[PDB]
């Protein structure tokens, strides 16, 4: 018996296929390399995963100053999203139809994006006027304008290319959490809010790799191979690289590296040199194990290019994943089956309360 | 053909926390029957320690003064969002970076603040807060909760909530307990796991979610005959709230504890409630004779909480407050287990296809 449901199938899905041995990731049968090359914005990719077709892209977020100022952007969105249900009248999933849940998911999803941009901009500077946000034509451009005020158009393309690449990737802790809450018939705001807490866990995976210090130790040296060969010698693990995920190169890692190249990210050369140096140093010391570039390596390069701080990069990953969460919540609603696993008891047998340790200091009312 | 949706019957974990002996018709916490804890009248703060620690000794602490920073209009939403904000203000590190004693102390501190937040959210913004000196006069955590909320609570209602919170403290791998362990399996802080578990609690399909039987109990008290009312709902092809297929082999032992609590504490709606239960079981076991039909625990959970002046909108948060014991016990057990929960999903969707072949492609603006 293996605990933690490791290796069991929980659902069948039509949302997306991470074809690992095929070397491709597909959203509703559409390769993400086609979505990025044809310049499909995150708002339209959101609708594809959720609806199964194009057309009803993510709408602009309505004006709503973020009421949460906890100092943690994750806590801000997790608590702010849960508060949307009473003010917006979000009924439980059991009591509404599919189309109502879809709009409620799209409304709350883009509001989660607004909350993140506001929490990142901070309470210690005035908000970007809505009139300037109205000048933008996409959700990504609206997010970047709401946060930076004067965002670079190249940085908007970088964020858009990242969100589509991180929109959905099969089953994981946060996706599982959102489906379990939605399986209880709870409102979509409660499901999305619970998925934020699961995403906050360090063991969740997928969050951009903390490779910025390593890229800094190279820019002050001159040779990427010398540094990565030095880090492995001193016993420190090499970030952004490890066991293969897809059969060969991760397709999401390719679209993010191509985006950093096409958009002219200043740290592209040092990132490429670190990639070829880390792959060469690791494949040499461990010819038994497969080594490829983690997509989270190129994710951090693209996000740093768009002026995203390291403490904010997990929130950036959460923003793109909202599409996959919403698609899985809607699919779980149509499934209409409560997720109720079982547990086998191995604890103490039947005993009186007096025999329990520490009963003598207990006071009965 | 091996896949069953909803993970029904599959075994996710082993546990030493509690045993819902469905075959034996009894619920036990660390081996102690819930009927023994209620009859000997062990307070909820001590039952919290029993479930979390495996033994008595370190009771639940009185909550510190913390005016509710959120007022959303929903008691469940207030405690869910409020618990998540306990982490950046109290320095709650992720579960991976803290030891068992730190997680133990943090889970108890947040559990009592979840009770305080719910009491304040239920009192409302239109009422001044009860001074801490009045709350400090109480002797049990359940008494401080009723006092913080109601000011001068009926001691009979304190006993009702005390018997309800122990009866609802833990019940295995339900969706909220499962969610708390999944979030804990990611190593997130204990507040994020408790906050996520409350979201799964808010669902109407959750096991033990107090049923909306108050409209039915209002009609029986108004009409005066429980049988005809119950007879009419089934004759109209409508569902009967608080009754269905058996959970335990016979009666749910928690339903027995709550019904007995509504009796000895003089709940005004008990006589109508048992009249509804008798009429419901009689009519259901006659139309479906060969079926095992029992009273849902959600039925008497509704009567007991209403007896303690708990509105229907507060009831999910009242179950939330009692279930903090099982959540924290399972979060601590999940923390020691030290393994991420990783289910899998099989793709059965469309094969590779071009974007232009997708319906609605011409509604997409590019470049």
Write a brief caption for the model:
2 copies of one chain form a homodimer. By secondary structure, the first copy, chain A, is mainly alpha-helical.
Structure in words:
The first copy, chain A, has 365 residues and is mostly helical. Chain A is built from 16 helices and seven strands. In chain A, helix 5 packs antiparallel against helix 16 and helix 10 crosses helix 16. At the A-B interface, strand 1, strand 4, helix 3, helix 4 and helix 9 of A face strand 1, strand 4, helix 3, helix 4 and helix 9 of B. Strand 1 of chain A pairs parallel with strand 7 of chain B.
Q: What is this structure's SSE topology?
A:
The structure is a homodimer.
Chain A: E1 9-13, E2 16-19, E3 24-27, E4 30-31, H1 32-37, H2 42-51, H3 73-82, H4 84-88, H5 98-121, H6 130-133, H7 139-148, H8 153-165, H9 173-183, H10 188-199, H11 212-219, H12 224-233, E5 241-243, H13 251-262, H14 268-285, E6 291-293, H15 295-305, H16 313-335, E7 342-345
Antiparallel strand pairs in A: 2-3, 3-4, 5-6
Helix pairs in contact in A: 2-16, 3-5, 3-10, 5-7, 5-16, 8-13, 8-15, 8-16, 9-10, 9-16, 10-16, 12-14, 13-15
So what's the overall shape of chain A?
A: globular
**Helical content of chain A (DSSP H or I, runs of 4+):** 40-55%
Q: State the strand order across the main sheet of chain A.
A: 2-3-4
Indicate the radius of gyration of chain A in whole angstroms: 23 Å
Organism (chain B): Mycobacterium tuberculosis
EC number (chain B): 2.3.3.16
Protein name (chain B): Putative citrate synthase 2
Family (chain B): Belongs to the citrate synthase family.
